[PDB]
Amino acid sequence: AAQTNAPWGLARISSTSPGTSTYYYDESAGQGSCVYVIDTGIEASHPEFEGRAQMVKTYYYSSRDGNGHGTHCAGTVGSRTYGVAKKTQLFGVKVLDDNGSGQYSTIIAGMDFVASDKNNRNCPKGVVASLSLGGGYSSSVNSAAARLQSSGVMVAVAAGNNNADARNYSPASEPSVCTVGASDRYDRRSSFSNYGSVLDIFGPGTSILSTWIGGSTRSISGTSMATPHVAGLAAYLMTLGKTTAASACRYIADTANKGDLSNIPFGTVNLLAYNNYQA
């Protein structure tokens, strides 16, 4: 299938080159797979989700995203217009408050939650977790992510927007997960994007169009935006049968566009998520 006049990020991910406008992808579209969105919640009634999204857990007084961050990320994952894996299932996990804050024990609780909850879901093609949040280094947070990954879930985490080595941030620094940097239109490292050896792969994170609260849409920038492209991509490849949860991150780097990124410091990968589609 082919989505004409798609947002740049989707197009980028199905091209070997920057500057195109069509998003080429298999019609299967990540159906049969599940993506947990661990953020501020999802606005589940948003028409773009076609009813494929639902909140599953809150750690606060409400199950609603009064922030926008989560709804934006979910859209990049599998919303009709704005998402990678247009027919996936989405589950919202609200670990962050409407102010976007969240204590580590809550984020650790949300991760253990996902590792358990997935057992009572019907997700034949597999399970993915998309985590566009972070903070200063923490071993417990890291270990929570590792557990999640080990439980059989594709874990993808934002590298952070400090324009620093991600090694000092969690859970970006956990080696076992899929730490995602951000890029821009022109195949440049996004200026805010963290870097370092712990990075596994890059994705589009600058000026990404996505769903927003109140049934709207918004362009925003960040490693949060990049993270979902990858999680959405993994979900997609899992339904096609190309890879598994355990090996998705590796697979994505093997098959990536290599050497195209600029502004990539020595020691960081020059790897750009790529679906390798061929009609």
Partner: peptide, 4 residues
């Protein structure tokens, strides 16, 4: 944490 915070959102990214």
């Amino acid at each position: 944490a915070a959102p990214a």
